[PDB]
Design an enzyme around this catalytic site. Structure first.
Site, PDB file in Angstrom:
ATOM      1  CB  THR A 193      -0.908   0.040   1.250  1.00 58.91           C
ATOM      2  OG1 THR A 193      -1.726  -1.135   1.277  1.00 58.91           O
ATOM      3  CG2 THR A 193      -1.809   1.279   1.235  1.00 58.91           C
ATOM      4  CB  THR A 237      -2.723  -1.056  -1.621  1.00 57.87           C
ATOM      5  OG1 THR A 237      -1.895  -2.132  -1.172  1.00 57.87           O
ATOM      6  CG2 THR A 237      -4.186  -1.408  -1.346  1.00 57.87           C
ATOM      7  CB  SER A 285     -10.239  -0.658   2.535  1.00 52.55           C
ATOM      8  OG  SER A 285      -8.946  -0.077   2.557  1.00 52.55           O
ATOM      9  CB  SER A 286      -7.686  -0.032   7.360  1.00 50.66           C
ATOM     10  OG  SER A 286      -8.257  -1.120   8.074  1.00 50.66           O
TER      11      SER A 286
END
Ligand SMILES: N[C@@H](CCC(=O)O)C(=O)O
Ligand SMILES: [Ca+2]
Lengths: 190, 351
Positions: free
Chosen positions: A1, A19, A72-73
């Site tokens: 990422t 990413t 996702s984060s």
């Protein structure tokens, strides 16, 4: 990422985090395209209650499903001060992205650190499961002693993230900072 | 003079990225008259060549855009699971998850969204044509660039675990049986051809053209699921950003499918109840409060977050200041609460 930020002469801003998931993703190139393929599917919860590569868990909401986008984060972020774009930031780190960006925001607003100071400051992180307060090198032994006394399970681990940020001054001037954790990176302008 | 760390300064435009070459590509675009979005797309394509570790055409991501006039929006170009994906696809015969299948097999890939995302942004918010922002990347792929410490280190560490196990990958990133070393020149002729076709045919080249064919075949021949139908059905999506207010500052970040915006706002909402400035950076009290706040957010993440097009995410409740206040009242600055005693919050009274 990886994350990158941009601010143009007119004041427009863009923050991008993208990413393949892990480094090089699957490491599989798609035929003769020369394009590496992601392993983003690990971001889904493969089974309720079982952690993925970042120690994150899930259930029905983030279960694998056809045509579904795995949770996702990633957090490209912009902070506005006095009605104007002020901080443009973001970072890689899987489960740690949330806390890394959070620290950039807190460092800037609560501690008044300039963008470079906020970037070079040590980071800590707690993601509920596993139950440990992960820290980078850089915190005072006195402080860590107090945290352990409070009941935190301090775990010294690898450096977290790679923030690439830009702060917009009151007069419109730009200030930027690249993370010391990543080499060969760059923040530049004109 | 009192500062130990100094930021880079610029008067007109600025770019910050993980790679010097890509950053310079973005700055040149700005100097050429491109806006922030034009430059961002150029950097994105440049990193797809100079930072194969994460820069990509085969992955996905998010973009936050804020115009000079204040308009703030988010571009979701997260990968979509193939139509053939199933809930238990990563479980072994015993019902236990197999990390090998979700991380190193052809089943680990979602349908890529980067090309679709960049084009959606460029077409609506940019000013330059795709061919012009892809050109810098095309030249880097065709003519090559020198491998630096970052790339050499990553190839040797992370790359060794996967790249040499696939013929096409090894042919590009390996040399003389070892990973490319610092000082070596990395030329990516095949990627250059892909970039050249995207620049001339547009994003359809990736989702419906030759590239799509190459992806589908790679999958079909190795037990993967991504098909041409999957690629043709992919779409980037513009969504409303998640935002909050922290001590008079407004914070904008990504909404679901990302958990980032919601939890950053939730945690800030919790922290707002404490005098963080008083405690100061690196203090046990400040760290204690934040560590505790973070536990509740991650607990909520495990239960309520997912693709909003498939499940209803209670984002309003999660970013509600009253809810944050109820969490703040539980934090003991002198005693941490074990994670075993923390469960996802009851949101009913906040929605
Ligand atoms: N795939 C992760 C990012 C992993 C990383 O930052 O390395 C996510 O979307 O949250
Ligand atoms: Ca650096």
């Amino acid at each position: 990422t990886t994350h990158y930020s941009v601010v143009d002469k007119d004041g427009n801003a863009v923050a991008v985090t993208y990413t393949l998931n892990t480094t090089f993703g699957t490491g599989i190139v798609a035929g003769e395209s020369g394009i590496l393929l992601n392993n983003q599917m690990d971001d889904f919860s493969a089974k309720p209650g079982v952690p993925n590569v970042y120690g994150l868990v899930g259930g029905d909401a983030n279960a694998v499903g056809p045509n579904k986008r795995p949770l996702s984060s990633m957090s490209p972020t912009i902070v506005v001060k006095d009605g104007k774009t002020w901080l443009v930031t973001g970072s890689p780190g899987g489960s740690r992205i949330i806390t890394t960006v959070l620290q950039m925001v807190v460092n800037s607003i609560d501690y008044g650190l300039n963008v470079a100071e906020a970037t070079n400051a040590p980071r800590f992180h707690h993601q509920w499961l596993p139950d440990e307060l992960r820290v980078e090198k850089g915190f005072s032994p006195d402080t860590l002693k107090l945290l352990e006394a409070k009941g935190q399970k301090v775990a010294l681990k690898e450096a977290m993230g790679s923030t690439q940020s830009i702060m917009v001054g009151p007069d419109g001037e730009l200030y930027g900072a690249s993370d010391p954790r990543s080499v060969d990176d760059l923040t530049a302008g004109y | 003079e009192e500062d130990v760390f100094h930021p880079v300064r610029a008067k007109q435009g600025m770019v910050a990225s993980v790679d010097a070459t890509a950053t310079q590509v973005g700055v040149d675009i700005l100097k050429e008259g491109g806006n922030a979005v034009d430059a961002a797309v150029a950097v994105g394509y440049a990193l797809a060549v100079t930072h194969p570790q994460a820069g990509n055409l085969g992955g996905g991501g998010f973009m936050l855009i804020r115009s000079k006039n204040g308009n703030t929006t988010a571009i979701d170009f997260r990968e979509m699971a193939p139509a053939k994906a199933t809930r238990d696809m990563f479980l072994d015969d015993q019902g236990n998850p197999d990390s090998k299948k979700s991380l190193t097999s052809h089943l680990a890939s979602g349908t890529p969204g980067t090309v679709a995302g960049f084009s959606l942004a460029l077409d609506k918010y940019g000013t330059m044509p795709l061919n012009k922002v892809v050109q810098p990347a095309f030249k880097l792929a065709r003519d090559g660039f020198i491998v630096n410490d970052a790339l050499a280190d990553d190839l040797k560490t992370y790359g060794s675990e996967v790249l040499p196990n696939h013929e096409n990958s090894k042919a590009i990133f390996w040399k003389e049986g070892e990973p490319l070393k610092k000082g070596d020149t990395l030329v990516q002729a095949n990627l250059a051809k892909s970039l050249e076709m995207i620049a001339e045919n547009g994003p359809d080249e990736f989702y419906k053209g030759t590239i799509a064919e190459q992806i589908a075949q790679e999958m079909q021949k190795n037990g993967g699921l991504i098909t041409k139908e999957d690629l043709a059905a992919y779409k980037a999506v513009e969504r409303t950003p998640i935002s909050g207010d922290y001590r008079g500052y407004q914070v904008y970040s990504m909404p679901p499918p990302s958990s980032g915006g919601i939890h950053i706002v939730q945690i800030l909402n919790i922290l707002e109840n404490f005098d963080m400035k008083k405690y100061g950076f690196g203090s046990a009290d400040a760290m204690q409060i934040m560590a505790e706040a973070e536990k509740y957010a991650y607990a909520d993440r495990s239960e309520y977050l997912g693709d909003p097009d498939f499940v209803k995410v209670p984002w309003q409740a999660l970013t509600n200041k009253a809810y944050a206040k109820s969490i703040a009242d539980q934090i003991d600055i002198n005693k941490a609460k074990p994670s075993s005693e923390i469960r996802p919050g009851k949101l009913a009274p906040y929605e």
